[PDB]
């Protein structure tokens, strides 16, 4: 309803409100010391999906090497932007380079560059440059008949990666048990493993690689950004109408007529809530009233046929979508699915 009451109180444009309410952009509620492109992130800032993903999960990219070729970089070596990983592929961000699926493992027996072939249904169980005593497993497979083990002692070398993963992270080697787990979030100075011998020096998401027995901290921030009416209700609950009115009144003395014209429009809405006793967050619905059944009847006509009102169909859609969202939340469904369900629930209420 132009001009929107929610937008006027929160100072959001018609487009900005729609983007948040229908899950197109994020709105920052707690930057958590997040920096985006060299600038600190500030509260009430709108983030696109790519910006949120970069801030919340970091920067990484996978480059598929052509079959047969061998990369010019080793597993676990830092790269810079523009560096050539393989003979024909060049990275676009600096970070740790990781072999995704090594197609050939070349062990060096001591008495001998024996080689073994790696297939998609097989996975290597040892890191690069590892000494293998005669008998230890090297490449695992579904069928033990094709499983690969080491006849004698040697050094395992991995070659021919299926693709190269460039991840902006910090690699922390460890020897004893790690005090963190995959998915945990850490801040500088937090202990990672070995009783404080290894500690985080940057924000990020901690992921433990047991094959490489290292701790990777994917540089990222624990920023609090949300979409939909849950974010808007968070802003509307935080409003101090007393404080907002005082600021608006001060801006009512600005020389410009447009500034005072806008301030009057905002303060008229602020005054309405202050005088009536209503709360701004009541403009977001948590419980939806249901009309009495006799005002939306499902009646049997003289011929025995049933006639019903349109409100029953609109209620059924909202209930079906609400129930489905509860099931998806109980299943721990990915964020993409949940966002679609929440966006559909908002539309069903509308």
């Amino acid at each position: 309803d132009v001009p929107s009451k929610i937008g006027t109180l929160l100072d959001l444009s018609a487009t900005e409100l729609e983007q948040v309410l229908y899950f197109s952009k994020y709105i920052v509620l707690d930057p958590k010391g997040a920096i985006l492109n060299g600038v600190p992130v500030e509260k009430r800032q709108l983030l696109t999906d790519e910006e949120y993903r970069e801030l919340r999960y970091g920067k990484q990219e996978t480059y598929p090497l052509p079959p047969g070729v061998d990369a010019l970089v080793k597993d676990g070596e830092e790269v810079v932007k523009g560096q050539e990983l393989a003979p024909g592929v060049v990275s676009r961000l600096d970070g740790v380079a990781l072999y995704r699926f090594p197609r050939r493992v070349r062990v060096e027996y001591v008495k001998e560059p024996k080689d073994y072939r790696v297939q998609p249904h097989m996975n290597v169980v040892v890191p690069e440059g590892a000494r293998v005593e005669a008998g230890d497993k090297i490449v695992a497979a579904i069928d033990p008949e094709e499983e690969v083990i080491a006849e004698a002692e040697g050094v395992v070398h991995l070659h021919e990666p299926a693709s190269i993963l460039v991840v902006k992270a910090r690699v922390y080697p460890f020897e004893d048990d790690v005090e963190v787990s995959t998915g945990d979030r850490v801040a500088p100075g937090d202990v990672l493993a070995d009783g404080g011998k290894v500690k985080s020096d940057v924000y990020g998401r901690v992921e433990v690689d047991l094959v490489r027995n290292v701790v990777r901290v994917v540089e990222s921030y624990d920023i609090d950004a949300r979409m939909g009416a849950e974010a808007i209700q968070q802003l509307l609950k935080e409003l101090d109408l007393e404080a907002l009115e005082k600021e608006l009144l001060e801006e009512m003395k600005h020389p410009s007529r447009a500034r005072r014209a806008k301030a009057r429009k905002r303060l008229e809405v602020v005054r309405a809530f202050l005088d009536s006793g209503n709360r701004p967050e009541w403009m977001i619905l948590e419980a939806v009233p249901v009309l009495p059944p006799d005002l939306r009847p499902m009646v049997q006509v003289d011929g025995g046929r049933f006639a019903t009102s349109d409100l029953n169909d609109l209620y059924r859609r909202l209930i079906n979508r609400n129930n489905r969202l509860k099931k998806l939340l109980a299943q721990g469904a990915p964020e993409i699915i949940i966002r679609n369900e929440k966006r559909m629930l908002q539309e069903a209420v509308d």
Partner: protein, 338 residues
């Protein structure tokens, strides 16, 4: 498109690259390994396997998701207090839980391709996609990579099943059980085949014969009567949309002014007729016929109020009923109400 929910959803699912053969196998193996690791964790700590998986899932999904968080943090700490050999299963559980999320997110195009073939059957395109997504989540739970079958071959079964069950459960205002929905669909197919073979609409006898044993013309007709959707009360009638079905349907629940008055007139006349009776005879009839408390009392219950035996109450009521009959005959002021 901000205005188009479907275009917005397609763009979002297009931001996750498709999985290759090697990528799919590792994700499936990690999911399989994580579930085995979770089962071992429950055995070692004795905790409920569901609780362990929920705690692991909460840690992976992060703090952006609304058992309170403190209990999760407590179970997380207890798991992390295990020795290194037992912490290895916790690491495997976390990796497997993350793999489950990426395997699901990478196959959201598969549901859309399957779901576009089910439109026009009562559910909207986005409703079909979300129901299909639920089958895709179920497929990841049961998919077995040891069999060397690709994910789409096994997942397509669950995606279709979820969409079809959703249609059977949500496509009608008056829900018909799934088994009855199957009967309706089969009957429509049989009639359509007969119609294209007889060069006309088949009768119930032809449809019943083609359906098989246990079917007759009566059953075919009752099933067709069962499958009639309600009509909208707001459907327009006429070229100018100012009249609707609801404007022509009378209300037959509330009594009419004429019905209410005749009920009140009868009560007044019956009250006067009961005046000619004795003080106790009127009470007996009013108690037995439910003219006082609203509900009929019995001879024994009536006797309980008055302290008389069951047989006597029956006779006194009968005499009073005979009295009233005599009065009515001599006046005939109460026969019109019958």
């Amino acid at each position: 498109s901000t205005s188009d929910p479907v275009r917005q959803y397609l763009h979002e699912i297009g931001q996750v690259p498709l999985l290759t053969l090697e990528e799919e196998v590792e994700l499936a193996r990690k999911v399989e390994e994580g579930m085995e690791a979770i089962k071992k964790l429950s055995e070692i700590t004795g905790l409920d396997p569901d609780l362990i998986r929920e705690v692991v899932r909460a840690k992976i999904l992060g703090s952006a998701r609304v058992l309170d968080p403190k209990t999760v943090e407590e179970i997380d700490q207890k798991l992390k207090s295990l020795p290194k050999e037992h912490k290895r299963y916790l690491h495997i559980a976390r990796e497997g839980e993350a793999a489950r999320q990426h395997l699901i997110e990478a196959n959201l195009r598969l549901v859309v391709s399957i779901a576009k073939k089910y439109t026009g059957r009562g559910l909207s395109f986005l409703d079909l996609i979300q129901e299909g997504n639920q089958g895709l989540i179920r497929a990841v739970e049961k998919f077995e990579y040891k069999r060397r079958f690709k994910f789409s071959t096994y997942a397509t079964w669950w995606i279709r099943q979820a969409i079809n069950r959703a249609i059977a459960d949500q496509a009608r205002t008056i829900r018909i059980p799934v088994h009855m929905v199957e009967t309706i669909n089969k009957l429509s197919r049989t009639a359509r085949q007969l119609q294209q073979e007889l060069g006309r609409e088949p009768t119930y006898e032809e449809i019943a014969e083609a359906m098989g044993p246990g079917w007759d013309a009566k059953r075919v007709e009752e099933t067709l009567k069962i499958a009639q959707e309600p009509v909208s009360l707001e459907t327009p009638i006429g070229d100018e949309k100012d009249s609707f079905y609801g404007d022509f349907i009378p209300d037959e629940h509330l009594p009419s002014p004429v019905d209410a008055a005749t009920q009140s007139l009868l009560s007044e006349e019956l009250e006067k007729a009961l005046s000619k009776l004795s003080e106790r005879e009127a009470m007996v009839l009013k108690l037995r016929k439910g003219l006082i408390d609203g509900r009929e009392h019995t001879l024994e219950e009536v006797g309980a109020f008055f302290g008389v035996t069951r047989e006597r109450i029956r006779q006194i009521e009968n005499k009073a009923l005979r009295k009233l009959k005599y009065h009515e005959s001599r006046t005939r002021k109460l026969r019109d109400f019958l």
